[PDB]
């Protein structure tokens, strides 16, 4: 029984999202890649470096936005850019969110020497694909 | 704040190598000939021997960045075949898809 | 052939590279100087990225109140529990 990313059928109660409810064998088929960068094309360089950064960024986002990420992020790059699309819950006040966002942009930019400009997606509840 | 002591050691070794690399290279150049005297070569060898270990480039072992494991480590991504797999499955590496073949 | 040899020499002279004739052994040095050494490559010395920086910064953020290592929090809680207990 292979059991990597595939969330497990316990009952008919578990609410699961579309990215979360699809096994790794669907990645190209019924799913897409979350991160997007040139490194993994061939021949091309600096993949390893990128991967670490990617790993960091998601974690950072989670830390910052606690109970305010509905689903996993989408990291994008265009030359010297680092765009992020976060699906966020309408839980906290907008002012707070605004405060957070700018800070994140600045801090990340100073870290990676790359102008970040993340764009949020306010959705009241987690967008259920299956009640697994 | 590295994963374990082994990792730290490796890092240290790398640093040492970086520090003393040029000199090492020079000494190797001096050594590896049929050109020029034998005594000189011997001296060079001696010097090399004297120079501290860990500055040696061969002691540099590859591990995964995330989990400090020496084997199953792809040099393209510098991560272990467990960590890498984990990354891949969720879809956090662009390009990496399962080989339906 | 002598003429051929001469031509080769001329070519070598033109294209910078080793002019005087020599062995496969002495070319090693040349190769070395052409290359970077293995220790000076950006793959090698910067194989593991910072790590310390990553940890420390995160810790600082947590202290401030702009980030939350949930795992760290859990650990802290566990420690507290232990203290309460036995220990």
């Amino acid at each position: 029984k292979n059991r990597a990313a595939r969330v497990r059928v316990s009952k008919g109660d578990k609410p699961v999202t579309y990215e979360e409810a699809h096994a790794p064998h669907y990645i190209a088929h019924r799913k897409g890649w979350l991160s997007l960068h040139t490194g993994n094309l061939d021949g091309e360089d600096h993949a390893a470096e990128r991967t670490v950064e990617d790993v960091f960024l998601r974690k950072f986002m989670w830390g910052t936005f606690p109970g305010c990420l509905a689903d996993q992020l989408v990291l994008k790059r265009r030359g010297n850019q680092l765009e992020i699309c976060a699906v966020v819950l309408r839980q906290l006040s907008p002012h707070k969110y605004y405060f957070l966002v700018g800070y994140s942009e600045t801090l990340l930019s100073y870290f990676y020497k790359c102008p970040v400009r993340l764009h949020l997606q306010t959705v009241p509840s987690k967008v259920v694909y299956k009640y697994l | 704040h590295y994963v374990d002591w082994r990792m730290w050691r490796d890092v240290k070794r790398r640093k040492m190598a970086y520090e003393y690399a040029d000199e090492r290279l020079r000494i190797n150049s001096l050594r590896k000939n049929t050109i020029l005297p034998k005594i000189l070569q011997d001296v060079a060898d001696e010097e090399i021997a004297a120079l501290p270990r860990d500055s040696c480039p061969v002691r540099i072992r590859n591990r995964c960045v995330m989990t400090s494991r020496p084997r199953g480590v792809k040099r393209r991504w510098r991560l272990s075949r467990i960590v890498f797999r984990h990354l891949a499955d969720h879809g956090q590496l662009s390009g990496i898809q399962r080989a339906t073949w | 052939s002598e003429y051929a040899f001469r031509m080769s020499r001329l070519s070598a002279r033109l294209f910078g590279e080793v002019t005087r004739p020599t062995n496969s052994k002495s070319m090693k040095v040349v190769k070395l100087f052409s290359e970077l050494p293995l220790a000076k490559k950006k793959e090698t010395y910067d194989w593991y990225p910072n790590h310390h920086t990553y940890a420390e910064l995160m810790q600082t953020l947590r202290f401030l109140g702009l980030y939350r290592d949930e795992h760290q929090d859990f650990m802290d809680e566990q420690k507290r529990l232990k203290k309460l207990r036995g220990k």
Binding site: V55, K59, W62 | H1, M66, T67 | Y54, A55, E70
Partner: peptide, 20 residues
């Protein structure tokens, strides 16, 4: 390290051990 850490849910699951 920081990369050796992970999300809370997993940790909780590990702690609980409600799946033999």
């Amino acid at each position: 390290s920081f990369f050796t850490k992970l999300t809370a849910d997993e940790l909780w699951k590990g702690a609980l051990a409600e799946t033999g």
